[PDB]
Amino acid sequence: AVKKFKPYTPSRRFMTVADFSEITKTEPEKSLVKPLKKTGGRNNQGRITVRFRGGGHKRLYRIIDFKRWDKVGIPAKVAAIEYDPNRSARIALLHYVDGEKRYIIAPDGLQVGQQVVAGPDAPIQVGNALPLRFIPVGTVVHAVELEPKKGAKLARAAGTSAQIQGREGDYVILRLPSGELRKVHGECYATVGAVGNADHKNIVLGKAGRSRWLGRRPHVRGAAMNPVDHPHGGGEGRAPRGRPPASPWGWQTKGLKTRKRRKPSSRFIIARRKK
Amino acid sequence: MKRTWQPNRRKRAKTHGFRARMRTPGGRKVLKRRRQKGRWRLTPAVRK
RNA sequence: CCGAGGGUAGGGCCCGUGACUGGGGCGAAGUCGUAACAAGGUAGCUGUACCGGAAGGUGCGGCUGGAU
RNA sequence: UGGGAGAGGGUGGUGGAAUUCCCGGAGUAGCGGUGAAAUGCGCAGAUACCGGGAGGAACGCCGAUGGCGAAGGCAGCCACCUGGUCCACCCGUGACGCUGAGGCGCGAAAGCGUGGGGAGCAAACCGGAUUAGAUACCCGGGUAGUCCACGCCCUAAACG
RNA sequence: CGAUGUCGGCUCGUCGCAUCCUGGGGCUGAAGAAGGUCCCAAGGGUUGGGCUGUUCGCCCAUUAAAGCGGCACGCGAGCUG
RNA sequence: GAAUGCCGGCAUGAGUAACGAUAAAGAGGGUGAGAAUCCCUCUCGCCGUAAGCCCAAGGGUUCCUACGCAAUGGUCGUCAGCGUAGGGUUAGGCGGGACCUAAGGUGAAGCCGAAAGGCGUAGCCGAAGGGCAGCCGGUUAAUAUUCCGGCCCUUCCCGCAGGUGCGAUGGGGGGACGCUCUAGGCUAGGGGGACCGGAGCCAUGGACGAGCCCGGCCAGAAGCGCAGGGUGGGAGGUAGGCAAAUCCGCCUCCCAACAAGCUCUGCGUGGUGGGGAAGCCCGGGUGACAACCCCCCGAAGCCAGGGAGCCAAGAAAAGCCUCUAAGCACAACCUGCGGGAACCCGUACCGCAAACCGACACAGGUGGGCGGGUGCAAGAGCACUCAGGCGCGCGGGAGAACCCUCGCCAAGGAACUCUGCAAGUUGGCCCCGUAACUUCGGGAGAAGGGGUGCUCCCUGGGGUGAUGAGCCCCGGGGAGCCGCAGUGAACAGGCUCUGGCGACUGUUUACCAAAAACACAGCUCUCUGCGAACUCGUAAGAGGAGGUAUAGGGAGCGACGCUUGCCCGGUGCCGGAAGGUCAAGGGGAGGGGUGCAAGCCCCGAACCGAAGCCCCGGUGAACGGCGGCCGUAACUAUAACGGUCCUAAGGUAGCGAAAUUCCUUGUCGGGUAAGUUCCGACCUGCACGAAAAGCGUAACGACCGGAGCGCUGUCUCGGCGAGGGACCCGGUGAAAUUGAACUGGCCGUGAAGAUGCGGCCUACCCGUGGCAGGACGAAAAGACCCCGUGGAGCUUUACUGCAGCC
RNA sequence: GAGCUAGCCCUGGCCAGGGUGAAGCUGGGGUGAGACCCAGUGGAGGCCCGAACCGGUGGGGGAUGCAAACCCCUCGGAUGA
Ligand SMILES: CC(C)C[C@@H]1CCO[C@@H]2[C@H](CN[C@@H]2C(=O)N[C@H]2[C@H]3O[C@H](SC[C@H](F)C/C=C\[C@H]2C)[C@H](O)[C@@H](O)[C@H]3O)C1
Ligand SMILES: [Mg+2]
Ligand SMILES: [Mg+2]
Ligand SMILES: [Mg+2]
Ligand SMILES: [Mg+2]
Ligand SMILES: [Mg+2]
Ligand SMILES: [Mg+2]
Ligand SMILES: [Mg+2]
Ligand SMILES: [Mg+2]
Ligand SMILES: [Mg+2]
Ligand SMILES: [Mg+2]
Ligand SMILES: [Mg+2]
Ligand SMILES: [Mg+2]
Ligand SMILES: [Mg+2]
Ligand SMILES: [Mg+2]
Ligand SMILES: [Mg+2]
Ligand SMILES: [Mg+2]
Ligand SMILES: [Mg+2]
Ligand SMILES: [Mg+2]
Ligand SMILES: [Mg+2]
Ligand SMILES: [Mg+2]
Ligand SMILES: [Mg+2]
Ligand SMILES: [Mg+2]
Ligand SMILES: [Mg+2]
Ligand SMILES: [Mg+2]
Ligand SMILES: [Mg+2]
Ligand SMILES: [Mg+2]
Ligand SMILES: [Mg+2]
Ligand SMILES: [Mg+2]
Ligand SMILES: [Mg+2]
Ligand SMILES: [Mg+2]
Ligand SMILES: [Mg+2]
Ligand SMILES: [Mg+2]
Ligand SMILES: [Mg+2]
Ligand SMILES: [Mg+2]
Ligand SMILES: [Mg+2]
Ligand SMILES: [Mg+2]
Ligand SMILES: [Mg+2]
Ligand SMILES: [Mg+2]
Ligand SMILES: [Mg+2]
Ligand SMILES: [Mg+2]
Ligand SMILES: [Mg+2]
Ligand SMILES: [Mg+2]
Ligand SMILES: [Mg+2]
Ligand SMILES: [Mg+2]
Ligand SMILES: [Mg+2]
Ligand SMILES: [Mg+2]
Ligand SMILES: [Mg+2]
Ligand SMILES: [Mg+2]
Ligand SMILES: [Mg+2]
Ligand SMILES: [Mg+2]
Ligand SMILES: [Mg+2]
Ligand SMILES: [Mg+2]
Ligand SMILES: [Mg+2]
Ligand SMILES: [Mg+2]
Ligand SMILES: [Mg+2]
Ligand SMILES: [Mg+2]
Ligand SMILES: [Mg+2]
Ligand SMILES: [Mg+2]
Ligand SMILES: [Mg+2]
Ligand SMILES: [Mg+2]
Ligand SMILES: [Mg+2]
Ligand SMILES: [Mg+2]
Ligand SMILES: [Mg+2]
Ligand SMILES: [Mg+2]
Ligand SMILES: [Mg+2]
Ligand SMILES: [Mg+2]
Ligand SMILES: [Mg+2]
Ligand SMILES: [Mg+2]
Ligand SMILES: [Mg+2]
Ligand SMILES: [Mg+2]
Ligand SMILES: [Mg+2]
Ligand SMILES: [Mg+2]
Ligand SMILES: [Mg+2]
Ligand SMILES: [Mg+2]
Ligand SMILES: [Mg+2]
Ligand SMILES: [Mg+2]
Ligand SMILES: [Mg+2]
Ligand SMILES: [Mg+2]
Ligand SMILES: [Mg+2]
Ligand SMILES: [Mg+2]
Ligand SMILES: [Mg+2]
Ligand SMILES: [Mg+2]
Ligand SMILES: [Mg+2]
Ligand SMILES: [Mg+2]
Ligand SMILES: [Mg+2]
Ligand SMILES: [Mg+2]
Ligand SMILES: [Mg+2]
Ligand SMILES: [Mg+2]
Ligand SMILES: [Mg+2]
Ligand SMILES: [Mg+2]
Ligand SMILES: [Mg+2]
Ligand SMILES: [Mg+2]
Ligand SMILES: [Mg+2]
Ligand SMILES: [Mg+2]
Ligand SMILES: [Mg+2]
Ligand SMILES: [Mg+2]
Ligand SMILES: [Mg+2]
Ligand SMILES: [Mg+2]
Ligand SMILES: [Mg+2]
Ligand SMILES: [Mg+2]
Ligand SMILES: [Mg+2]
Ligand SMILES: [Mg+2]
Ligand SMILES: [Mg+2]
Ligand SMILES: [Mg+2]
Ligand SMILES: [Mg+2]
Ligand SMILES: [Mg+2]
Ligand SMILES: [Mg+2]
Ligand SMILES: [Mg+2]
Ligand SMILES: [Mg+2]
Ligand SMILES: [Mg+2]
Ligand SMILES: [Mg+2]
Ligand SMILES: [Mg+2]
Ligand SMILES: [Mg+2]
Ligand SMILES: [Mg+2]
Ligand SMILES: [Mg+2]
Ligand SMILES: [Mg+2]
Ligand SMILES: [Mg+2]
Ligand SMILES: [Mg+2]
Ligand SMILES: [Mg+2]
Ligand SMILES: [Mg+2]
Ligand SMILES: [Mg+2]
Ligand SMILES: [Mg+2]
Ligand SMILES: [Mg+2]
Ligand SMILES: [Mg+2]
Ligand SMILES: [Mg+2]
Ligand SMILES: [Mg+2]
Ligand SMILES: [Mg+2]
Ligand SMILES: [Mg+2]
Ligand SMILES: [Mg+2]
Ligand SMILES: [Mg+2]
Ligand SMILES: [Mg+2]
Ligand SMILES: [Mg+2]
Ligand SMILES: [Mg+2]
Ligand SMILES: [Mg+2]
Ligand SMILES: [Mg+2]
Ligand SMILES: [Mg+2]
Ligand SMILES: [Mg+2]
Ligand SMILES: [Mg+2]
Ligand SMILES: [Mg+2]
Ligand SMILES: [Mg+2]
Ligand SMILES: [Mg+2]
Ligand SMILES: [Mg+2]
Ligand SMILES: [Mg+2]
Ligand SMILES: [Mg+2]
Ligand SMILES: [Mg+2]
Ligand SMILES: [Mg+2]
Ligand SMILES: [Mg+2]
Ligand SMILES: [Mg+2]
Ligand SMILES: [Mg+2]
Ligand SMILES: [Mg+2]
Ligand SMILES: [Mg+2]
Ligand SMILES: [Mg+2]
Ligand SMILES: [Mg+2]
Ligand SMILES: [Mg+2]
Ligand SMILES: [Mg+2]
Ligand SMILES: [Mg+2]
Ligand SMILES: [Mg+2]
Ligand SMILES: [Mg+2]
Ligand SMILES: [Mg+2]
Ligand SMILES: [Mg+2]
Ligand SMILES: [Mg+2]
Ligand SMILES: [Mg+2]
Ligand SMILES: [Mg+2]
Ligand SMILES: [Mg+2]
Ligand SMILES: [Mg+2]
Ligand SMILES: [Mg+2]
Ligand SMILES: [Mg+2]
Ligand SMILES: [Mg+2]
Ligand SMILES: [Mg+2]
Ligand SMILES: [Mg+2]
Ligand SMILES: [Mg+2]
Ligand SMILES: [Mg+2]
Ligand SMILES: [Mg+2]
Ligand SMILES: [Mg+2]
Ligand SMILES: [Mg+2]
Ligand SMILES: [Mg+2]
Ligand SMILES: [Mg+2]
Ligand SMILES: [Mg+2]
Ligand SMILES: [Mg+2]
Ligand SMILES: [Mg+2]
Ligand SMILES: [Mg+2]
Ligand SMILES: [Mg+2]
Ligand SMILES: [Mg+2]
Ligand SMILES: [Mg+2]
Ligand SMILES: [Mg+2]
Ligand SMILES: [Mg+2]
Ligand SMILES: [Mg+2]
Ligand SMILES: [Mg+2]
Ligand SMILES: [Mg+2]
Ligand SMILES: [Mg+2]
Ligand SMILES: [Mg+2]
Ligand SMILES: [Mg+2]
Ligand SMILES: [Mg+2]
Ligand SMILES: [Mg+2]
Ligand SMILES: [Mg+2]
Ligand SMILES: [Mg+2]
Ligand SMILES: [Mg+2]
Ligand SMILES: [Mg+2]
Ligand SMILES: [Mg+2]
Ligand SMILES: [Mg+2]
Ligand SMILES: [Mg+2]
Ligand SMILES: [Mg+2]
Ligand SMILES: [Mg+2]
Ligand SMILES: [Mg+2]
Ligand SMILES: [Mg+2]
Ligand SMILES: [Mg+2]
Ligand SMILES: [Mg+2]
Ligand SMILES: [Mg+2]
Ligand SMILES: [Mg+2]
Ligand SMILES: [Mg+2]
Ligand SMILES: [Mg+2]
Ligand SMILES: [Mg+2]
Ligand SMILES: [Mg+2]
Ligand SMILES: [Mg+2]
Ligand SMILES: [Mg+2]
Ligand SMILES: [Mg+2]
Ligand SMILES: [Mg+2]
Ligand SMILES: [Mg+2]
Ligand SMILES: [Mg+2]
Ligand SMILES: [Mg+2]
Ligand SMILES: [Mg+2]
Ligand SMILES: [Mg+2]
Ligand SMILES: [Mg+2]
Ligand SMILES: [Mg+2]
Ligand SMILES: [Mg+2]
Ligand SMILES: [Mg+2]
Ligand SMILES: [Mg+2]
Ligand SMILES: [Mg+2]
Ligand SMILES: [Mg+2]
Ligand SMILES: [Mg+2]
Ligand SMILES: [Mg+2]
Ligand SMILES: [Mg+2]
Ligand SMILES: [Mg+2]
Ligand SMILES: [Mg+2]
Ligand SMILES: [Mg+2]
Ligand SMILES: [Mg+2]
Ligand SMILES: [Mg+2]
Ligand SMILES: [Mg+2]
Ligand SMILES: [Mg+2]
Ligand SMILES: [Mg+2]
Ligand SMILES: [Mg+2]
Ligand SMILES: [Mg+2]
Ligand SMILES: [Mg+2]
Ligand SMILES: [Mg+2]
Ligand SMILES: [Mg+2]
Ligand SMILES: [Mg+2]
Ligand SMILES: [Mg+2]
Ligand SMILES: [Mg+2]
Ligand SMILES: [Mg+2]
Ligand SMILES: [Mg+2]
Ligand SMILES: [Mg+2]
Ligand SMILES: [Mg+2]
Ligand SMILES: [Mg+2]
Ligand SMILES: [Mg+2]
């Protein structure tokens, strides 16, 4: 439920902030946080390899449990729902009856005080995690492993989910957040429900400095540069593209497909994405 | 106005020091050349 | 002290007028088409939307004040 | 107090028919369309037929000259929440009534905002016909929209 | 071309006369007044403003008149820009 | 003898410019061969959120003392950051190391690369971050939290006592954290005192006073007090914290809970140890048995790991505590106490500057802390002042032009000019009051006005204290006084109307452009299913991201509002298992060479044979593009209408002489006495037009345009005055430039603009202050222009390669 | 060679004083319940004014400079990109 501001500054006109109404705890679990090495887009050579990065707020990384088949059959209680600055989803704190404490991505609907459980036997309930094969067809699911025991890979951002469409041998057919239809192996785990905080996409950053807080440095158009810099650079006055619109490195950037031709996973993609 | 030389003993020893030169093929050629030329100092002085 | 009024500054309402511009009314015999009245030759009207020299047309939903 | 009928409203489920698209099979010289055609589609294998799948929308028969609502309006089926209303008994209150400038709420369609959805249909638009013309009627396409949520708009041959 | 700074303005002048005014004339289709045209004449004079970077030009208000040209389209080791 | 030659020397310019902030000097005494310049005294001025004081860098003896003055010092010099010599820097507690980790760096394992080398988990290094024990005073010419004095403390070793399951690089707890706002209580610091201490003072008309002037504290162990921080206790279960665990985590039960207790800091007090002014007298002595007290103000510092709110969600590791494992429980560890032990490096001095970075004793640059008082609403602003530190290392005169910086100006008031450029005006606070428009915030300090000192009287509330007095803080009313004038000095908006552009705050060409440019939230297209795409790299490996389509890359557009039309023929991209073409390879009809021959060797057609291209489609917020001629209405004119050619389609809405309009100062209207600019219209748009977005838009802008009011030395049109220079004298003393010079005007001549040639004219020799017409003056081997089969950046459907991708 | 300058990473530090007065909260009003209104409290913001600090808009000076970019007056930001 995005929060608005009155227009008492030029920027407060349009700025919207998340309501934080599901958050029940506001400092993280000390045993589950570790320092997040900020990069600024620089690789091990020190070269910028992803432009316009750096300068964002400091962050601690919350270790997230993307396996859950770690602890089959062991119920846990949802102790808290917490803000995670490293991802769009919120995160839920789990207290296992083990005494072990872990973080999961917080699905929509999940409540503090309810219990979740992982395993082939687990009830089909929001927050439980089962192998894909034991989830009934038609079930909305998130935090999906792409390959068995390799870790949850798909549908992790706020509001996203995959839907189960059917089974075909050892595999299930998922409709991913992108609308692609893909065969994912049935022993891959998934968590029942959609990821929460679906209002994330309606946040209006509102001002330039808000992008700066997030580590996003200003992005400068090719058309603003010189020919030394960019295909779209130069010209007297403004200039249209004057050639097929291109990236700084010369490749076409309006339509040109880029998935590797002979990639082995093509056997498992049924239909490319939609809209 | 702020000029270009802003001395700093740690910066000097770590950039041009003896150990910086020995760590690298190019740096060792520097020491080799300055020895062959007979330089009284192979490396800049800094008071550490 | 108050004080006719004069001065300075800023408001409100009304009247007249203005390059140009909007449509309206009227005007014996102009130009274009033929929308409506017969099922008016696509039943008509309608609120709305979009479009078209023009009347109009078309979409959606409504009315019979529609014929057979 | 005790009963009844009902597409009255809201929510969430869920059932089959049909259209479209995808896949597999089978099969070949046309299909479609009209007043007649053409555009379109089809040997790069269409149409027609069979099995599988996805998805949206609308609910055939019952169905009526029917029923419900204050009106706008409401139609598969199920459950829940809820309004109105009628009848019987003649039990309670004791005129506590009628209307109602303002106010408030409701208000078909189209339209608007933000998300979502999108099968069919279809303003705009394109093409094919027709015609003196044809910014139409007819044909092949087709974007909004038609659908859902929330928020607006507040119109009507909102009529008996 | 081992550089002769380029438009306009400002400042400062000085010169020519094919004279705008003022002085002297002849002719007039010169009654007077006022003009026209030509001759002599360079002593002095030849305004303020609106517009534009402007030179120029148009306009306002005047004036005896609001001259036209040369001086590296006078003048940036004088200024402006 | 020339090369703007090279090296050196020495001239010219010239006793010229200058002598480095306009904070400022004068006199007496002394020293000395010599004194504006050194020392001392008195007087004057300057800084005082510094121009004072303390750290950190960097510098490296510059520190102190004696003896010196050749050079260095912009003059002088007896002086000096200079020369010579001697002296000077003292630590278990300050800083760093024998402690910890951060980025990063390095790197057993391992990975990769022709070589060189590149990576890389642990580990190691790495600090201004974490951690850790010293405060006050005295002393030296020069060091001091270092020496000394007083009072405190830390670790290591060993011993004694008491206690305990002791024991770790392993487990756990803790360390451990943001931004804004902020409570209570304190401290630093400060103000006042009619109280306490003090050498003295009475002046010049008055004052012997509840007079003036000076000072009225600092550190301190335990204990105690005040204020805070941290922290539940017990039991039972237990499968998690990669072994174990009595610890931690999770479950349950009992009790405690805005407490308390325990613990830990801060402040206060505290044995004790110190300090102690003016003034006077020669840094010292005295004052002095110095006194050392009360009230008020009060932090941004402390208690602190405090509290609240918010979103952008805020290091690590060790010290420390707890758990246990090998082990070992004659040990070991814990607590107390005692004795012993306690290393290396730095320490001088400068440090907003004459000692650092700028070639200079250079008006520039340099991070942290302290930074007193009064008044002005506040404040680190401003004026003046304390402590402290300076008068800026050439002076003395004069009182021209001219220049700079500054003050004023009769009448006028933008007439100045490209332009109100510049300079006026306005200016703080309190109160009254405030428009279109608007996105309801704003526009707004709109505009425009009134008030402002001092005195007396009456009075309201708050803080401290006690509820009072005193002190302190916000006020209210009445009556008066003075001046030209009361934010009386200093610091402190001119305003309005209307266009263009850009939404806005931001960013930029270091050193000629700050803007309309870039960025920006927002909108759209597009790629990307994760070992993602993309990027850097030969690779390994990284980034992307410990992210996962509500995400990430690329591209354009640029808040917001209302919108974004038609063309897919060409180019691009997307789809298309057919067909055409298509390399290596397959195939081998059929030939050829050689050999006696078996053979060996060579050429080789059909046909099979990828991507790409052809071909069929799609696609515009992909590259792009969006017509011509002729005719027509009952006045004329003009054409709603028509004809025909052409195209892939012929520009829609909106806007338009525009940041675009050539003709052009279009035409008309407004504004002006007058308007090439401006605003409003018209539309024959040379040559607008819809995300290289179209049209608007409140608010914003050191943007660019037009107007008005206010006010002015901008101007008519200049005048006077101030200081710093210019000028003169003493000291010191450059520069570019320079073929040599005994270097005049005119009219001619000349390579076409002559001091230098001809003919005239004019002219005694040599300077000083000035002005800039000439020496085609200086400066820079023209940056425009061309030329060179000269170079370099950039582009592309130029050529040819290469990476990359297929 | 990044001791200048550009960006990023780690760790510290700094931003006098004054002004405006968002959300929320409380109370009150309102209603069937609401929305909502008013008052108080509150202290938000690439908010406002203005030092330090960071800039460099206009003009003047300087131009063999104090200075190979300085000086004076004026001006922009100053809790934030
Ligand atoms: C239509 C025009 C283009 C014709 C043109 C005009 C240019 O100038 C002349 C040329 C002929 N030669 C002339 C020439 O070269 N002037 C140069 C001058 O540069 C500076 S003046 C600072 C100026 F800002 C630069 C202006 C001029 C530079 C080039 C020197 O101090 C001067 O001595 C002098 O050298 C003719
Ligand atoms: Mg908002
Ligand atoms: Mg609002
Ligand atoms: Mg939430
Ligand atoms: Mg940790
Ligand atoms: Mg990283
Ligand atoms: Mg590395
Ligand atoms: Mg990149
Ligand atoms: Mg980057
Ligand atoms: Mg994310
Ligand atoms: Mg989150
Ligand atoms: Mg799989
Ligand atoms: Mg968004
Ligand atoms: Mg961030
Ligand atoms: Mg971004
Ligand atoms: Mg950009
Ligand atoms: Mg550009
Ligand atoms: Mg550019
Ligand atoms: Mg480059
Ligand atoms: Mg290139
Ligand atoms: Mg290029
Ligand atoms: Mg280009
Ligand atoms: Mg360009
Ligand atoms: Mg152009
Ligand atoms: Mg450009
Ligand atoms: Mg082009
Ligand atoms: Mg291209
Ligand atoms: Mg896909
Ligand atoms: Mg610099
Ligand atoms: Mg240098
Ligand atoms: Mg530096
Ligand atoms: Mg150093
Ligand atoms: Mg250092
Ligand atoms: Mg360094
Ligand atoms: Mg190095
Ligand atoms: Mg070194
Ligand atoms: Mg080598
Ligand atoms: Mg070697
Ligand atoms: Mg030697
Ligand atoms: Mg060396
Ligand atoms: Mg009167
Ligand atoms: Mg009709
Ligand atoms: Mg008809
Ligand atoms: Mg009809
Ligand atoms: Mg008809
Ligand atoms: Mg139509
Ligand atoms: Mg076939
Ligand atoms: Mg579908
Ligand atoms: Mg009864
Ligand atoms: Mg309605
Ligand atoms: Mg569709
Ligand atoms: Mg057609
Ligand atoms: Mg016909
Ligand atoms: Mg030339
Ligand atoms: Mg020369
Ligand atoms: Mg020249
Ligand atoms: Mg020259
Ligand atoms: Mg002038
Ligand atoms: Mg005359
Ligand atoms: Mg006459
Ligand atoms: Mg004359
Ligand atoms: Mg003119
Ligand atoms: Mg002209
Ligand atoms: Mg006359
Ligand atoms: Mg002339
Ligand atoms: Mg000429
Ligand atoms: Mg000419
Ligand atoms: Mg000239
Ligand atoms: Mg000239
Ligand atoms: Mg000049
Ligand atoms: Mg000139
Ligand atoms: Mg000259
Ligand atoms: Mg000259
Ligand atoms: Mg010779
Ligand atoms: Mg020379
Ligand atoms: Mg030479
Ligand atoms: Mg020579
Ligand atoms: Mg030489
Ligand atoms: Mg020489
Ligand atoms: Mg010699
Ligand atoms: Mg010499
Ligand atoms: Mg001389
Ligand atoms: Mg002289
Ligand atoms: Mg001279
Ligand atoms: Mg000089
Ligand atoms: Mg000088
Ligand atoms: Mg000064
Ligand atoms: Mg001065
Ligand atoms: Mg003297
Ligand atoms: Mg002297
Ligand atoms: Mg002397
Ligand atoms: Mg002196
Ligand atoms: Mg002295
Ligand atoms: Mg005296
Ligand atoms: Mg002071
Ligand atoms: Mg000497
Ligand atoms: Mg001397
Ligand atoms: Mg001497
Ligand atoms: Mg000597
Ligand atoms: Mg000297
Ligand atoms: Mg000097
Ligand atoms: Mg002597
Ligand atoms: Mg010493
Ligand atoms: Mg010691
Ligand atoms: Mg040791
Ligand atoms: Mg270490
Ligand atoms: Mg190895
Ligand atoms: Mg190699
Ligand atoms: Mg290191
Ligand atoms: Mg270390
Ligand atoms: Mg340290
Ligand atoms: Mg220490
Ligand atoms: Mg101590
Ligand atoms: Mg001594
Ligand atoms: Mg913590
Ligand atoms: Mg933390
Ligand atoms: Mg920290
Ligand atoms: Mg924050
Ligand atoms: Mg307080
Ligand atoms: Mg104290
Ligand atoms: Mg005080
Ligand atoms: Mg256990
Ligand atoms: Mg004493
Ligand atoms: Mg004594
Ligand atoms: Mg502070
Ligand atoms: Mg670490
Ligand atoms: Mg054992
Ligand atoms: Mg034993
Ligand atoms: Mg113990
Ligand atoms: Mg040692
Ligand atoms: Mg020392
Ligand atoms: Mg300074
Ligand atoms: Mg400092
Ligand atoms: Mg000094
Ligand atoms: Mg000096
Ligand atoms: Mg200096
Ligand atoms: Mg003040
Ligand atoms: Mg001085
Ligand atoms: Mg000074
Ligand atoms: Mg001086
Ligand atoms: Mg004189
Ligand atoms: Mg004055
Ligand atoms: Mg006066
Ligand atoms: Mg005057
Ligand atoms: Mg005036
Ligand atoms: Mg006036
Ligand atoms: Mg003017
Ligand atoms: Mg100008
Ligand atoms: Mg003034
Ligand atoms: Mg003022
Ligand atoms: Mg108005
Ligand atoms: Mg108003
Ligand atoms: Mg206005
Ligand atoms: Mg307006
Ligand atoms: Mg308003
Ligand atoms: Mg005012
Ligand atoms: Mg008053
Ligand atoms: Mg007075
Ligand atoms: Mg008076
Ligand atoms: Mg102001
Ligand atoms: Mg802007
Ligand atoms: Mg801009
Ligand atoms: Mg704009
Ligand atoms: Mg805008
Ligand atoms: Mg700002
Ligand atoms: Mg620049
Ligand atoms: Mg430049
Ligand atoms: Mg430069
Ligand atoms: Mg400039
Ligand atoms: Mg510029
Ligand atoms: Mg600016
Ligand atoms: Mg820019
Ligand atoms: Mg913008
Ligand atoms: Mg989008
Ligand atoms: Mg690469
Ligand atoms: Mg990572
Ligand atoms: Mg992106
Ligand atoms: Mg926009
Ligand atoms: Mg932009
Ligand atoms: Mg349109
Ligand atoms: Mg096309
Ligand atoms: Mg096409
Ligand atoms: Mg195409
Ligand atoms: Mg092929
Ligand atoms: Mg083109
Ligand atoms: Mg084209
Ligand atoms: Mg026009
Ligand atoms: Mg325009
Ligand atoms: Mg144009
Ligand atoms: Mg024009
Ligand atoms: Mg023109
Ligand atoms: Mg005109
Ligand atoms: Mg007019
Ligand atoms: Mg206009
Ligand atoms: Mg026209
Ligand atoms: Mg474009
Ligand atoms: Mg353009
Ligand atoms: Mg476009
Ligand atoms: Mg509007
Ligand atoms: Mg605007
Ligand atoms: Mg505006
Ligand atoms: Mg601006
Ligand atoms: Mg700005
Ligand atoms: Mg600006
Ligand atoms: Mg003057
Ligand atoms: Mg003077
Ligand atoms: Mg003399
Ligand atoms: Mg001399
Ligand atoms: Mg000398
Ligand atoms: Mg000679
Ligand atoms: Mg001679
Ligand atoms: Mg001579
Ligand atoms: Mg002569
Ligand atoms: Mg000639
Ligand atoms: Mg001549
Ligand atoms: Mg001569
Ligand atoms: Mg001669
Ligand atoms: Mg001769
Ligand atoms: Mg001769
Ligand atoms: Mg001669
Ligand atoms: Mg002669
Ligand atoms: Mg003569
Ligand atoms: Mg002289
Ligand atoms: Mg002279
Ligand atoms: Mg001259
Ligand atoms: Mg001259
Ligand atoms: Mg000359
Ligand atoms: Mg010459
Ligand atoms: Mg000359
Ligand atoms: Mg040369
Ligand atoms: Mg040349
Ligand atoms: Mg040159
Ligand atoms: Mg150039
Ligand atoms: Mg040429
Ligand atoms: Mg050639
Ligand atoms: Mg040639
Ligand atoms: Mg060439
Ligand atoms: Mg080249
Ligand atoms: Mg190659
Ligand atoms: Mg690629
Ligand atoms: Mg650097
Ligand atoms: Mg740096
Ligand atoms: Mg910081
Ligand atoms: Mg600040
Ligand atoms: Mg308030
Ligand atoms: Mg609150
Ligand atoms: Mg601000
Ligand atoms: Mg203000
Ligand atoms: Mg600067
Ligand atoms: Mg400046
Ligand atoms: Mg100025
Ligand atoms: Mg210069
Ligand atoms: Mg100033
Ligand atoms: Mg400000
Ligand atoms: Mg501030």
DSSP A199: G
Tell me the CA end-to-end span of chain B in Å, nearest whole number.
Answer: 28
Identify the bridge partners of residue A154 per DSSP, sorted by sequence position. Answer: A144
Q: Which residues pair with A25 in a beta bridge?
A: A82
Q: Which nucleotides of G are covered by protein (CB under 7 A)?
A: 1-5, 7-11, 22-23, 44-47, 69-70, 80-81
Half-sphere exposure of A79 (CA within 13 A, CB side): 16
For the stretch A171-176, contacts whose Cβ atoms lie closer than 8 Å and that sit 24 or more positions apart, written own/partner, are A171/A268, A172/A132, A172/A133, A172/A135, A173/A270, A174/A132, A174/A141, A174/A144, A176/A273
Contact present, A115 and A75 (Cβ < 8 Å): yes
Under 8 Å between Cβ of A191 and A107: yes
What span, in angstroms and rounded, lies between the C-alpha atoms of A201 and A50? Answer: 23
Query: How remote is the CA of residue A119 from the centroid of ligand 75, in Å?
Result: 95
Query: How far is CA A78 from its chain centroid?
Result: 21
**A159 CA to middle of ligand 149, Å?**
64
Both tokens of A235, joined, read: 């010209």
CB of A59 within 7 Å of some strand G atom:
no
Is residue A42 classed as helix, strand or coil in its secondary structure?
Answer: strand
Count Cα atoms within 13 angstroms, Cβ side, for B16: 11
| Contact indicator for A53, A40 with CB cutoff of 8 Å | yes
Residue A43 CA to residue A21 CA, distance in Å, equals 38
In angstroms, the CA A230 to CA A8 distance is 40
Phi, psi angles (nearest 5°) of residue B20 = -60, -40
Q: How was this structure determined?
A: X-ray
CB-CB neighbours of A195 under 10 Å: 25
Angle at A104 between CA A102 and CA A106, to 5 degrees: 140
Looking across all nucleic acid strands, the nucleotide with the smallest C1' to CA distance from residue A274 is F549
| Pick from A220, A242, A224, A243: nearest CA to A234 | A224
CB B43 within 8 A of CB B20: no
CB of A202 lies under 7 Å from some atom of strand D: yes
Residue A20 contacts residue A26 (beta carbons within 8 Å): no
**What is the whole-number distance in angstroms between the Cα of residue A267 and the centre of ligand 87?**
82
Token readout for A273 is 């994405």
Report chain A's terminal Cα–Cα distance, integer Å: 26
Q: Are B2 and B30 in contact (CB under 8 A)?
A: no
The Å distance, Cα B24 to ligand 141 centre, comes to: 73
Task: Return the H-helix or E-strand segment holding A86.
Answer: none
Resolution in A: 2.5
Strand segments, DSSP code E, in chain A are 3-4, 16-17, 33-35, 60-62, 76-82, 91-96, 101-105, 115-116, 129-131, 140-142, 144-145, 152-154, 162-168, 171-175, 181-185, 189-192, 269-271
C1' of F253 to CA of A101 (Å): 24
Return d(Cα A179, Cα A64) in angstroms, integer: 26
- HSE value, Cβ hemisphere, 13 Å, CA-based, for A83: 12
Q: Which helix (H) or strand (E) holds A87?
A: none
